[PDB]
Amino acid sequence: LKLPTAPLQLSGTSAQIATLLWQVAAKENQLDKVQDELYQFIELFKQHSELRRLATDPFVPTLVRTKIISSVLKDSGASEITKKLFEALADEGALSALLEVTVNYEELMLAHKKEVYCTVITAEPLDKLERVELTKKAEKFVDAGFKLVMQEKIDKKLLGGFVIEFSDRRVDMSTAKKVEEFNNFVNKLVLSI
């Protein structure tokens, strides 16, 4: 066959269902109908205690657990991706995997609108030109056609420059560390002469 490439490669057995769920929802152009139908089901477990009894209670028979789920999802225009997923997770008793699929469905979705989050920490609050010169620095730290959003915080422990935090890497072009990276270079070099 031929499925779309998932943007991220993820972990296993709950992140592995979510990347299969993303791939059949990218084939059907249902990447946001399936996503909010997950988000409805997250809310459906909070309100109904007998719906979450179909995911935690081990003494629910599997013939009950797949017939409550199918006869409840037969209408209301749910995606055929969704009501096939939910009878599959109810066949195996994996309905409690659903908080963990929804989290990994988000990370595949947010890497599909290449929107990457950010946090910029500066010394004092920015100008409108200090904002524009900074994204020109910062979209050279995302390696594709990605867009950075931003989040602006302040720290006068920095002496100007900035710290960009991407939640999996940071880049420190602040001059408070440029001082320390200068000092330790000349504290190493006078000991080499």
């Binding site: 592995q16 059949v24 059907e28 935690t56 195996e92 409690s96 995997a97 659903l98 908080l99």
Partner: peptide
């Protein structure tokens, strides 16, 4: 928190995706 029962899943099958892929793929047009 009332959703905290579902935060940690454990499965009865190591090959759970091989059953899930046999029901999600024929949901495609």
């Amino acid at each position: 928190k009332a959703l905290d029962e579902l935060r940690k899943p454990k499965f009865s099958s190591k090959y759970l995706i091989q059953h899930v892929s046999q029901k999600l793929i024929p949901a495609v047009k």
